[PDB]
Design an enzyme around this catalytic site. Structure first.
Site, PDB file in Angstrom:
ATOM      1  N   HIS A 261      89.478   6.380 -20.707  1.00  0.00           N
ATOM      2  CA  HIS A 261      90.517   6.611 -21.712  1.00  0.00           C
ATOM      3  C   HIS A 261      90.292   7.889 -22.538  1.00  0.00           C
ATOM      4  O   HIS A 261      91.185   8.728 -22.633  1.00  0.00           O
ATOM      5  CB  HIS A 261      90.629   5.357 -22.602  1.00  0.00           C
ATOM      6  CG  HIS A 261      91.753   5.382 -23.592  1.00  0.00           C
ATOM      7  ND1 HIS A 261      91.523   5.590 -24.953  1.00  0.00           N
ATOM      8  CD2 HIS A 261      93.073   5.168 -23.403  1.00  0.00           C
ATOM      9  CE1 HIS A 261      92.711   5.531 -25.533  1.00  0.00           C
ATOM     10  NE2 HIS A 261      93.678   5.282 -24.642  1.00  0.00           N
TER      11      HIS A 261
ATOM     12  N   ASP B 174      87.538   7.393 -29.929  1.00  0.00           N
ATOM     13  CA  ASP B 174      87.960   6.777 -28.685  1.00  0.00           C
ATOM     14  C   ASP B 174      86.750   6.154 -27.958  1.00  0.00           C
ATOM     15  O   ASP B 174      85.746   5.794 -28.586  1.00  0.00           O
ATOM     16  CB  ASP B 174      88.632   7.909 -27.867  1.00  0.00           C
ATOM     17  CG  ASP B 174      89.669   7.514 -26.835  1.00  0.00           C
ATOM     18  OD1 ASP B 174      89.513   6.454 -26.212  1.00  0.00           O
ATOM     19  OD2 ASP B 174      90.596   8.306 -26.600  1.00  0.00           O
TER      20      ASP B 174
ATOM     21  N   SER C  91      99.030   6.465 -26.709  1.00  0.00           N
ATOM     22  CA  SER C  91      97.855   7.308 -26.968  1.00  0.00           C
ATOM     23  C   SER C  91      98.093   8.698 -26.338  1.00  0.00           C
ATOM     24  O   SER C  91      97.807   9.711 -26.980  1.00  0.00           O
ATOM     25  CB  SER C  91      96.581   6.658 -26.461  1.00  0.00           C
ATOM     26  OG  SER C  91      96.545   6.647 -25.050  1.00  0.00           O
TER      27      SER C  91
END
EC number: 3.4.21.-
Lengths: 92, 275
Positions: free
Chosen positions: B55, B23, B215
């Site tokens: 994120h 990520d 996600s």
């Protein structure tokens, strides 16, 4: 039998960097020789190339920064299964 | 009062499993995940065209966070394959997947779960690398994609050996994300909570923020897989998939949200933990 592939989503393509994927069971030593061979043949044609990474463990092959003009030559290298132009991935 | 998604999957586990995350950078000293995520030296990101780690920090929290995580006992290892804008490359992801397998051969641990909260177009090479890593015995979980489209047109979502996860909301319906939303189709294995997911915010060491996306949904399935593999470590990938379907809520998604031809192809399953 070696084929070329590039991202169907044209804005996500990253031309100039290619993943050369060699046949299953090609050894790291063979992938390094294939990468050196591409660099030598491209240099004879007046092209600069850079081997960014040599893969082994999951897929045999290498990552190369070069002009796409060299793709017909690269598809004729020993052990080549296919070549894929690099492309973008995004956080979901 | 608990976050809706954590109640939805419940009809400190996951301690035998390590979850790898590919990520953005992660704020590893956030109180929600400090001591739970080991940041590897791995970084392979393209140049850009508190926010850089947004994120990844949230997803690390969804998997194993102290207050809002699914598998609070699982350990995580992070690899940076997404830049500050959330963009990566297929080659960077390939190098990251190879790094995980090299790390495993050098120092084997228990079952490994790899979370891929990212998507690009269909990629023969990314699908082959995922297929090889899955055949090597590693469990891969990926986001179905947030394009309101057939997941078979994206990678790693289209790889059959990867557990592909779509997103559902608190009404058990497919998530809308702006004008788009969760992907669907025959390449999706199941859906999981992916709307208004409370999780660690990298804005401050104790901050929390709600996020939506496939996600987040994939991170829920990575946490459920970690709990399932910790309880039954000998499960093969085929058996783990059987368990995920078995413990899922069935037929609660209103299939009318999907395009007509995708209704029979899309699995009507919302993930949940075993009782």
């Amino acid at each position: 039998t070696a084929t070329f592939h590039r991202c169907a989503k044209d804005p996500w393509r990253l031309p100039g960097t290619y993943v050369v994927v060699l046949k299953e069971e090609t050894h790291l030593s063979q992938s390094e020789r294939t990468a050196r061979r591409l660099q030598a043949q491209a240099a004879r044609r007046g092209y600069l190339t850079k081997i960014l990474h040599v893969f082994h463990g999951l897929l045999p092959g290498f990552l190369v920064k070069m002009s796409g003009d060299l793709l017909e030559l690269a598809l004729k290298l020993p052990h080549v299964d296919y070549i894929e132009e690099d492309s973008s991935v995004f956080a979901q | 009062s608990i976050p809706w998604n954590l109640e939805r999957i419940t009809p400190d586990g996951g301690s035998l499993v390590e979850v790898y995350l590919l990520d953005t950078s992660i704020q590893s000293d956030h109180r929600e995940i400090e001591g739970r995520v080991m940041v590897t030296d791995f970084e392979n990101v393209p140049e850009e065209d508190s926010k850089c780690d947004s994120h990844g920090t949230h997803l690390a929290g969804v998997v194993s966070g102290r207050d809002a995580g699914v598998a609070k006992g699982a350990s995580m290892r992070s690899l940076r394959v997404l830049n500050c804008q959330g963009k990566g490359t297929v080659s960077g992801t390939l190098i990251g997947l190879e790094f995980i397998r090299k790390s495993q051969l050098v120092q084997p641990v228990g079952p490994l779960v790899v979370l891929l909260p990212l998507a690009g177009g269909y990629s023969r090479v990314l699908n082959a690398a995922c297929q090889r890593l899955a055949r090597a015995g590693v469990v891969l979980v990926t986001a179905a994609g947030n394009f309101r489209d057939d997941a078979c047109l994206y990678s790693p979502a289209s790889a059959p050996e990867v557990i592909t996860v779509g997103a559902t909301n608190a009404q058990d319906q497919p998530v809308t994300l702006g004008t788009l939303g969760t992907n669907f189709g025959r390449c999706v294995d199941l859906f999981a909570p992916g709307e208004d997911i409370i999780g660690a915010s990298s804005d401050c060491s104790t901050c929390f923020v709600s996020q939506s996306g496939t996600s987040q949904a994939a991170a829920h399935v990575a946490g459920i897989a970690a709990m399932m593999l910790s309880a039954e470590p000998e499960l093969t990938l085929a058996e783990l998939r059987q368990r995920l379907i078995h413990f899922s809520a069935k037929d609660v998604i209103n299939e009318a949200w999907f395009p007509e031809d995708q209704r029979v192809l899309t699995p009507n399953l919302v993930a949940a933990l075993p009782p």
